[PDB]
Swiss-Prot record:
UniProt note on tissues of expression: Expressed in mammary epithelial cells and breast cancer cell lines. Found in the luminal epithelium surrounding the ducts in the normal breast. In the brain, expressed in somatodendritic compartment of neurons in the cortex and hippocampus and in the cerebellum it is found in the Purkinje cells and some granule cells (at protein level). Detected in brain, heart, colon and kidney. In the kidney, expressed in glomerular podocytes, in some tubules and in the collecting duct.
Induction: Strongly up-regulated by progestin treatment.
Gene: WWC1
Subunit structure: Homodimer. Forms heterodimers with WWC2 and WWC3. Interacts with DDN. Interacts with DYNLL1 and histone H3. The interaction with DYNLL1 is mandatory for the recruitment and transactivation functions of ESR1 or DYNLL1 to the target chromatin and the interaction with histone H3 ensures proper regulatory interaction of WWC1-DYNLL1-ESR1 complexes with target chromatin. Interacts (via WW domains) with DDR1 (via PPxY motif) in a collagen-regulated manner. Interacts with PRKCZ (via the protein kinase domain).
Protein's cellular compartments: Cytoplasm, Perinuclear region; Nucleus; Cell projection, Ruffle membrane; Cytoplasm, Cytosol
Reported function: Regulator of the Hippo signaling pathway, also known as the Salvador-Warts-Hippo (SWH) pathway. Enhances phosphorylation of LATS1 and YAP1 and negatively regulates cell proliferation and organ growth due to a suppression of the transcriptional activity of YAP1, the major effector of the Hippo pathway. Along with NF2 can synergistically induce the phosphorylation of LATS1 and LATS2 and function in the regulation of Hippo signaling pathway. Acts as a transcriptional coactivator of ESR1 which plays an essential role in DYNLL1-mediated ESR1 transactivation.
Record protein name field: Protein KIBRA
Record-stated family: Belongs to the WWC family. KIBRA subfamily.
From-to range in the entire protein, with total length: 658 to 785 of 1113
Domain C2 per the UniProt entry, residue ranges: 3-126
Length: 130
């Protein structure tokens, strides 16, 4: 069972509150990305380039590695729609431990230039690249 590890993500812009929502849903074929097992896994979400007025880096809770791994965490970011549209979303799948050191083994980048203003939300799957 070796192919691409994929992450499912929903994105939605809230113009009433001028905020972007990022819903990290789940991982599939995670076995393909890990050599070891039992490992803890979290997702690191970066909204780039990093606007240093607001917070641009986020992290899921860590979970025990499983080939399919559901996180269902939402992160909200304050940002005008024009600002959102210059942005790229970086999400990396990382292992971790009591050291708290991230071992981010692969990720995806998602240009946000075409996020809709409407709030009709976009849910897509993304291949990881290491
Ligand atoms: C960016 C918007 C913010 C937001 O709403 O995100 C909050 C999230 C998801 O909200 P929502 O209720 O709209 O999404 C459901 C969720 O994604 C579940 O996903 P999976 O676990 O991968 O199956 C789905 O069903 P449940 O097992 O009942 O939780 C369900 O998928 P579908 O619609 O059928 O495609 C979703 O309804 O809360 C978490 O689900 C927390 C669970 C209490």
């Amino acid at each position: 069972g070796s192919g691409a590890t994929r992450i499912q993500i929903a994105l939605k812009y809230d113009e009433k509150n001028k905020q972007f929502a990022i819903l990290i849903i789940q991982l599939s074929n995670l076995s393909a990305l890990l050599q070891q097992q039992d490992q803890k896994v979290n997702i690191r979400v970066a909204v780039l380039p990093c606007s240093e007025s607001t917070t641009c880096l986020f992290r899921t809770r860590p979970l025990d590695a499983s080939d399919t791994l559901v996180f269902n965490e939402v992160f909200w970011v304050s940002m005008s729609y024009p600002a959102l549209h210059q942005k790229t979303l970086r999400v990396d799948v990382c292992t971790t431990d009591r050291s708290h050191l991230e071992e981010c083994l692969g990720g995806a980048q998602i240009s946000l230039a075409e996020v809709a203003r409407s709030g009709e939300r976009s849910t897509r799957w993304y291949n990881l690249l290491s």
